[PDB]
Symmetry: C4
Subunit: 137 residues, 4 copies
């Protein structure tokens, strides 16, 4: 199953509402199971650099079926995945990207959020993915 | 507001005069609030590798509303932004990029400086940005 | 000697057999002595990000006549090859790439595997390369 | 002054001679003061990955007027130039790139060497640069 645009826009609205609640201005990306962009929302006032980061987080999460920070935990110096960010045109491996998981437990896409602390990025990401499905495989 | 070319050239000449005072030969870039190049000055004798770095520093500063070294403080191994430099076609996160801030407190662009020690890069950047506004949000 | 398509496909089959035995879904790439793609197999269910990583691993191994993790042992902070991954359009230096070495001891190509833990990647890579030659120079 | 093709080839021959003395197979690159390729020699049997590295080493040296490893000493985690390798389409900051310095003390280009240990890379580069000028500014 592929994330629909209706589902993607509902995730963005849930993410946007959390971001406001937290006092943040976020870029919010949704990609499909191939990493191809499905929807994007740049909140007024969000950092211009967060545009690319939010999309790379969404792509990273769906490319590996993991939350983005779970990869960064493995890609430190001495880590088993050291250097992995060079692949796939550039990954982002700090928090803010989460898989979208359908009721079957199949990954249908991913959300990527950037614009604030990575903790706030992850909270907004989680609200968006939680609005339309599960988040863990 | 957007930085004007008159402001950009005034910032460049102030940076140039500080660089001379310090015995340095610098590349000095100004970008607008979208990261697009507004003005650039390579001093005679400046390292060729500083051309790209000065421009990437200005872009990085304006993309995140921060001095570039403030991002590098967060992107070390174990840091919350570890790996961020892979985004946005390449960031520079050591000192030398500073936001240009208007009287309304709005970021209108950014300056970037490369060609010496990062401390002199930052001193020259600051002289340039202070000639045309504030530097902090 | 160059790796033939018959050898490349035999290696892929031996790698796929190992992957299934270990319970994994892998991308498997074979490149020739110039780093040019010779064969590729993405098992059903394999992570999409493993497509690029498997090819970069194979390229990395043939480009230096070493298993990929042997390079990463030398490219940690403080290591003699720190930063090598920025070369050659992006290298991968954790396990999963192995040279293919013909009976004369000449390197004819390399295999690259991605999709599970790096330990399983290397076991799958080994099974495939072992099926058509030696693995050490 | 610019390095001439006569100087570049004399430097290449001196490097090849030292590489043979050491039992190594090297790629040897000469770039002009702009970083543009002037001459290149891949010894028979040199690692294919050393083609790009030798050229990036020469580019890096001329771009900053330093031996490449002097930059890597500064670009470790915690270092003032951490992440500099992302600039200028990819630098190499381990040993093997050395500036070429004419009699007037002007840098006219650079040599870059890859194919063995970084220590042999640097010894071959030095042999080649020494043949046509000084190596320090």
């Amino acid at each position: 199953m592929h994330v629909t645009i209706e589902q993607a826009e509902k995730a963005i609205q849930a993410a946007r509402a959390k971001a406001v609640e937290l006092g943040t201005q976020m870029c919010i990306a949704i990609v499909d199971s191939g990493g191809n962009l499905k929807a994007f929302h740049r909140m007024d006032g969000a950092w211009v650099g967060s545009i690319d980061i939010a999309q790379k987080k969404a792509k990273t999460a769906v490319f590996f079926g993991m939350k983005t920070g779970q990869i960064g935990a493995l890609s430190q110096p001495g880590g088993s995945l050291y250097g992995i960010e060079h692949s796939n045109q550039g990954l982002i491996t700090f928090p803010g990207g989460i898989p979208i998981v359908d009721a079957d437990g199949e990954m249908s896409g991913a959300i990527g959020v950037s614009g604030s602390s990575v903790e706030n990025d992850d909270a907004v990401a989680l609200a968006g993915a939680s609005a339309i499905g599960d988040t863990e495989l």
